[PDB]
From a paper:
LCs were distributed in two groups: a set of eight amyloidogenic LCs responsible for severe cardiac involvement and symptoms in patients (hereafter, H LC), and a set of five non amyloidogenic LCs isolated from patients affected by multiple myeloma for which no amyloid aggregation or proteotoxicity was observed in patients (hereafter, M LC). Five H LCs (H3, H6, H7, H9 and H10) and two M LCs (M7 and M8) were successfully crystallized and their 3D-structures solved. The crystal structures were all refined to satisfactory refinement parameters; in all cases the LCs were dimeric, with an overall quaternary arrangement closely matching that of the previously reported LC dimers. VL and CL domains display very different structural properties in the seven crystal structures. CL domains (res 115–214) are typically characterized by high quality electron density, are all very well superposable, and the dimeric CL–CL arrangement is clearly conserved in all the analysed structures (root mean square deviations -r.m.s.d.- generally fall below 1.0 Å over the entire CL–CL dimer - Table S3A and Fig. 4B-bottom).
In H6 and M8 dimers all six CDRs (three for each LC monomer) are traceable in the electron density; in H9 and H10 five out of six are traceable, in H7 three, and in H3 and M7 only two CRDs are traceable. In some cases (H6, H9, H10) CDR3 (residues 89–97) participates in the interface; both CDR3s in the H7 dimer lack electron density, while in M7 and M8 CDR3 residues are located far from the VL–VL interface. In the structures of all H LCs and in M7, the association interface is roughly symmetric, and is located on the five-stranded beta sheet (strands 1, 3, 4, 7, 8), where the 3, 4, 7, 8 strands establish the intermolecular contacts. Interestingly, most LCs show a one-step unfolding process, but three H LCs (H3, H6, H7) and one M LC (M9) display a two-step process, observed both in Far- and Near-UV temperature ramps. Analysis of the data shows that the kinetics of proteolysis correlate well with amyloid propensity: H3, H6, H7, H9, and H16 are almost or totally proteolysed after 60 minutes, and more than 50% of H10, H15 and H18 LCs is cleaved after three hours. Inspection of the SDS-PAGE gels shows that the proteolysis pattern is different in different H LCs, suggesting that the sequence of proteolytic events, and not only their kinetics, may be characteristic of each H LC. It is also remarkable that fold stability and kinetics of proteolysis do not necessarily correlate: M7 displays the lowest Tmapp among the M LCs, but also very slow proteolysis kinetics; H3, H6 and H9 show relatively high Tmapp, within the H group, but are almost instantly proteolysed by trypsin. Firstly, and somewhat unexpectedly, the most temperature- and trypsin-sensitive LCs (H3, H6, H7, H9) could be successfully crystallized.
Residue numbers in the entry:
A (entry chain B), B (entry chain A): 2 to 213
The structure:
Amino acid sequence: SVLTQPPSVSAAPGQKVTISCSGNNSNIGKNYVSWYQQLPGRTPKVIMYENNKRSSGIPDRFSGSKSGTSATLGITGLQTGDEADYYCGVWDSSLSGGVFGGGTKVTVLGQPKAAPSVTLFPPSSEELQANKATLVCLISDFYPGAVTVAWKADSSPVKAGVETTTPSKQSNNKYAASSYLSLTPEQWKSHRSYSCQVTHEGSTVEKTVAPT
Amino acid sequence: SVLTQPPSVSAAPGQKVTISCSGNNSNIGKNYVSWYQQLPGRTPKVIMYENNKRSSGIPDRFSGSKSGTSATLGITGLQTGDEADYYCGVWDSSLSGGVFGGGTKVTVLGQPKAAPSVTLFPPSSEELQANKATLVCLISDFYPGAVTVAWKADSSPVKAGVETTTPSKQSNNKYAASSYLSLTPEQWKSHRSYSCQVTHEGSTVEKTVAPT
């Protein structure tokens, strides 16, 4: 870290966020400054180049500026999707090489709770032809990332055969997982219906499937 | 991803892994390369710089080198604490900014490798009756826990609305994930088929679905 960047910025949804980048005359003062976004677990991507030029597909929210030996990144209308680390980059002329800042964690404070979207899928045609039956309860767009999944065959709770993936942080910093129930085609065709009940922050969402 | 890295690399504890990072004369060829370690949950840290310089507290087991347009990070005496995601970074003298590799997942093999079980689910009847269409690619029973998923609309790759969850260990100790694709029921019916392609350890499998 040749460039000096604050360790973090926090703001409520819709608010304005500024990120400073402090350097000398050999780097920021002489050369083009670029900005990089890094979503957790993801590699850094360029979002701004040539001090204020926005990279392809980069939203209007994002704004970039250079003045003197200091660069700034402006995010107006902060969204939950902008929660990432931001780095500023410039070529150092003093020591002929590319330099970077320490980074800045951007937090959306007081984030609104998002109920999960729930899509239940019966065993596919191709699957049953292979004497295999799998039900998928796709659980998407929820926040925070914790869920309880319960299954039922008609009225009775299904204990075994259930697997629920650990909620993973999606593109929009919101979450997704999927619960799956592997049955024998004998077990599936026997019952009248199947249920997947998803509990998120105390509230339940239940969807139902039936054969054909 | 401008620089190219293999997505997954593994070996038994005590063995050796190498991670290739391929670029051009303008990036890897001219400038100094760094390597990043992104530990599970934690913030990425630089472990290698100036092609072969190790950071503080980085053991002898980690070695970096660069020949031509490609850099390699080697790891010997592979141990569980090395399991992380690693990426390369270099300045691109033509683009006048930093370029990064897509990342590599390093796995210390603790059980037999397992090829994924792939189940493609078309949009359900209840869903299409609501003018919504969701394709779900259930990927389970695989080890190591890293997949690359590609979607095709007939044969042309789908470049939008694809979400892939992070693999999580299940009750069988093997990993599971799911890739989902959102389409308008017109997008589902305008194509002959949709396909989900799962890449795991250089082995690739294709699943296909068609309307009814």
